[PDB]
């Protein structure tokens, strides 16, 4: 039981990390367009 | 990962602004990844939890004291190397968007 | 046993922190 909660929450945080990278990419396009 | 990434420089964001005429972002136009690579730097882990093999239906049930030590190691790595770094991702993207 | 209960409280605390992070992230409307 415990091992499977740790493995699951690891994958749930690696998914939020990908969410931040895809947000940073979108800001970077508006940044260029404003320059 | 396809690449052996070395660690990046310490934080391109203790800039206090200065006016005259031109934008500080003309330096960050030259390289296409400049803001994405900054977020990919602040997100960077030095330690993770390993991936754990599911225990067998034949194994001995462990003394509870070590499960608490294993979980206290696990949530701390998450608080120190993921949650804190994702709140720093947010504070950085907030400050970028406001500018 | 109080060891089993303390484990059952911190699992329920950390899962609440992780849902509260996901709520703080999905609410971040960057436009």
Task: Determine the Cα–Cα distance for residues B28 and B17; give it in Å rounded to an integer.
Answer: 15
The residues, ordered by sequence, that sit 6+ positions from B77 with a Cβ below 8 Å of its Cβ are B47, B48, B49
Asked how this structure was determined, the answer is cryo-EM
In 3D space, the residue among B43, B48, A18, A12 whose CA is nearest the CA of residue C15 turns out to be A12
In 3D space, the residue among B84, B75, B76 whose CA is nearest the CA of residue B42 turns out to be B84
Q: Tell me which of A10, A19, A21 to substitute to probe the interface with C (most C C-beta atoms closer than 10 Å).
A: A19
CB B11 within 8 A of CB B91: no
CA dihedral C13, C14, C16, C18 (to 10 degrees): 170
Residue B42 corresponds to which tokens in the numbers above? 């602040």
Taking an 8 Å cut-off on Cβ atoms, the answer to whether C21 and A16 are in contact is yes
Query: Resolution of the coordinates in A?
Result: 12.0
Task: Determine the Cα–Cα distance for residues B96 and B85; give it in Å rounded to an integer.
Answer: 16
Task: Determine the Cα–Cα distance for residues B39 and B81; give it in Å rounded to an integer.
Answer: 14
């Amino acid at each position: 039981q415990l091992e499977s909660l740790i493995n699951k929450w690891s994958l749930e945080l690696e998914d939020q990390e990908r969410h931040f990278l895809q947000q940073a990419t979108q800001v970077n396009a508006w940044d260029r367009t404003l320059i | 990962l396809s690449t052996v990434h070395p660690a990046s420089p310490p934080l391109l964001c203790t800039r206090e602004d200065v006016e005259v005429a031109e934008s500080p972002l003309r330096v960050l136009a030259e390289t296409p990844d400049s803001f994405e690579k900054h977020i990919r730097s602040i997100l960077q882990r030095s330690v993770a939890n390993p991936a754990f093999l599911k225990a067998s239906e034949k194994d001995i049930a462990p003394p509870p004291e070590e499960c608490l030590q294993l979980l206290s190691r696990a949530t701390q790595v998450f608080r120190e190397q993921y949650i804190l770094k994702q709140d720093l991702a947010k504070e950085e993207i907030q400050r970028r968007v406001k500018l | 046993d109080p060891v089993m209960a303390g484990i059952g409280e911190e699992i329920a605390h950390f899962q609440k922190e992780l849902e509260e992070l996901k709520a703080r992230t999905s609410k971040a409307c960057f436009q």
